[PDB]
Design an enzyme around this catalytic site. Structure first.
Site, PDB file in Angstrom:
ATOM      1  N   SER A 175       0.823  -1.194   0.000  1.00 14.77           N
ATOM      2  CA  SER A 175       0.000   0.000   0.000  1.00 14.77           C
ATOM      3  C   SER A 175       0.873   1.267   0.000  1.00 14.77           C
ATOM      4  O   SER A 175       1.826   1.330  -0.781  1.00 14.77           O
ATOM      5  CB  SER A 175      -0.955  -0.061   1.193  1.00 14.77           C
ATOM      6  OG  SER A 175      -2.076   0.751   0.931  1.00 14.77           O
TER       7      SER A 175
ATOM      8  N   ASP B 288      -8.077  -4.796  -6.871  1.00 15.30           N
ATOM      9  CA  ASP B 288      -7.368  -3.710  -6.191  1.00 15.30           C
ATOM     10  C   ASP B 288      -7.220  -2.416  -7.030  1.00 15.30           C
ATOM     11  O   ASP B 288      -6.693  -2.446  -8.142  1.00 15.30           O
ATOM     12  CB  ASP B 288      -5.980  -4.184  -5.762  1.00 15.30           C
ATOM     13  CG  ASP B 288      -5.278  -3.214  -4.842  1.00 15.30           C
ATOM     14  OD1 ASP B 288      -5.822  -2.141  -4.525  1.00 15.30           O
ATOM     15  OD2 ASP B 288      -4.166  -3.548  -4.414  1.00 15.30           O
TER      16      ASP B 288
ATOM     17  N   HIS C   9      -7.183  -5.644  -2.095  1.00 14.87           N
ATOM     18  CA  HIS C   9      -5.961  -4.973  -1.655  1.00 14.87           C
ATOM     19  C   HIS C   9      -5.415  -5.600  -0.372  1.00 14.87           C
ATOM     20  O   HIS C   9      -4.196  -5.774  -0.214  1.00 14.87           O
ATOM     21  CB  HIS C   9      -6.276  -3.502  -1.421  1.00 14.87           C
ATOM     22  CG  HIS C   9      -5.089  -2.656  -1.100  1.00 14.87           C
ATOM     23  ND1 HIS C   9      -3.972  -2.591  -1.908  1.00 14.87           N
ATOM     24  CD2 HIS C   9      -4.866  -1.795  -0.078  1.00 14.87           C
ATOM     25  CE1 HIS C   9      -3.107  -1.733  -1.393  1.00 14.87           C
ATOM     26  NE2 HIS C   9      -3.628  -1.228  -0.289  1.00 14.87           N
TER      27      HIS C   9
END
Ligand SMILES: *[C@@H]1O[C@H](CO)[C@@H](O[C@@H]2O[C@H](CO)[C@@H](O[C@@H]3O[C@H](CO[C@H]4O[C@H](CO)[C@@H](O)[C@H](O)[C@@H]4O)[C@@H](O)[C@H](O)[C@@H]3O)[C@H](O)[C@H]2NC(C)=O)[C@H](O)[C@H]1NC(C)=O
Ligand SMILES: *[C@H]1O[C@H](CO)[C@@H](O)[C@H](O)[C@@H]1O
Length: 278
Positions: free
Chosen positions: A145, A202, A255
């Site tokens: 991330s 994602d 994600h």
């Protein structure tokens, strides 16, 4: 520079055992990491700093496969789906510590560079210490991330400024970081060490957008369907056959999903991280 690769996908050539391990090492940065001797896959947790409030948690491990592993948390110190007019998303020059090592016209996103710069002295010091302590020459950088973009910058900085350079970098749900100049400089310096892994629908690899001057480096492996072991490699920069061929979901489910049998569930995932549990 700034193109989109049109060549076909190929089978995933990466070491899925290393990716599964790396995923664990970064999941653990979402958990308190001062318990002594903690073991994640093949690796021992040696050191931690930050906390995911002011700065991202960074863990230092020793791995027989990956060497001295640096893992960088990616919790939402700022949010990536908020107003793109904000100063966090502006492009800026490389920091004065390392601008000399980059081509002229290199640009990085302020938010990620700032956040890396607040950690970079301590990362360097701890890496140098635990390399000496463990007689280990290999340095692996891992992020997820926000921490994947920071980790790409860290990976580069290690390759450019540290003795011994970089071994590998594994990045999960990597946001864009730099301009076409930066991304081509990544290919050229660490392309053969670079592993970007994307899971399912994602959305995070689509931000910040290319219309603001941002470009990914070459190659990613994309796991589709989300959480399965079915995955291909999509070569070159910004492959037109990759992720935008399937509609992005606008939540963090995939994600924070399963990457080669290991969950990176983030703050509300598994603590301690469990390599190969899923
Ligand atoms: C791939 O694996 C992922 C897991 O690693 C899957 O992600 C999960 O997807 C589901 C639904 O699609 C998410 O569930 C939602 O959770 C929200 C969160 O808010 C609530 O949080 C607490 C948690 O206990 C709850 O008690 C409160 O009621 C809160 O409101 C819920 O509100 C929703 O009802 C919804 O069920 C999971 O959170 C999500 N997991 C993670 C870790 O993000 C993913 O779906 C898998 N993909 C595929 C294609 O199979
Ligand atoms: C994708 O297609 C273009 C031609 O439109 C080529 O430039 C490239 O080599 C790839 O085959």
């Amino acid at each position: 520079r700034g193109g989109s690769s049109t060549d076909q996908p190929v089978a995933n050539p990466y070491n899925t055992k290393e990716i599964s391990l790396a995923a664990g090492l970064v999941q653990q940065t979402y958990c308190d990491s001062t318990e002594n001797g903690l073991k994640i896959g093949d690796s021992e947790l040696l050191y931690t700093m930050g906390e995911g409030y002011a700065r991202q948690r960074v863990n230092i491990y020793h791995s027989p496969s990956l060497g001295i592993a640096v893992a960088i948390e990616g919790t939402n110190l700022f949010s990536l789906n908020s107003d793109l007019h904000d100063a966090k998303f502006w492009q800026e020059d490389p920091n004065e510590r390392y601008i000399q090592y980059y081509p002229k016209g290199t640009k990085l996103m302020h938010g990620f560079q700032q956040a890396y710069n607040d950690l970079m002295d301590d990362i360097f010091t701890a890496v140098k210490k635990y390399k000496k302590e463990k007689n280990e020459k290999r340095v692996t950088v891992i992020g997820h991330s926000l921490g994947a973009a920071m980790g790409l910058l860290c990976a580069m900085d290690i390759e450019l400024r540290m003795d011994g350079g970089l071994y590998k970098t594994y990045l999960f749900g990597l946001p864009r970081l730099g301009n076409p100049t930066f991304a081509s400089f990544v290919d050229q310096k660490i392309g053969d060490k670079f592993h970007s892994i994307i899971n399912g629908r994602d959305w995070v690899p689509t931000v910040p957008p290319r219309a603001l001057g941002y470009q990914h480096p070459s190659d990613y492996v994309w796991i589709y369907p989300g959480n399965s072991t079915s995955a291909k490699l999509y070569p070159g920069q910004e492959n037109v056959h990759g992720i935008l061929t399937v509609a992005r979901e606008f939540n963090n489910d995939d994600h924070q999903g399963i990457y080669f049998h290991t969950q990176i569930g983030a703050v509300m995932g598994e603590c301690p991280a469990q390599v190969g549990a899923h």
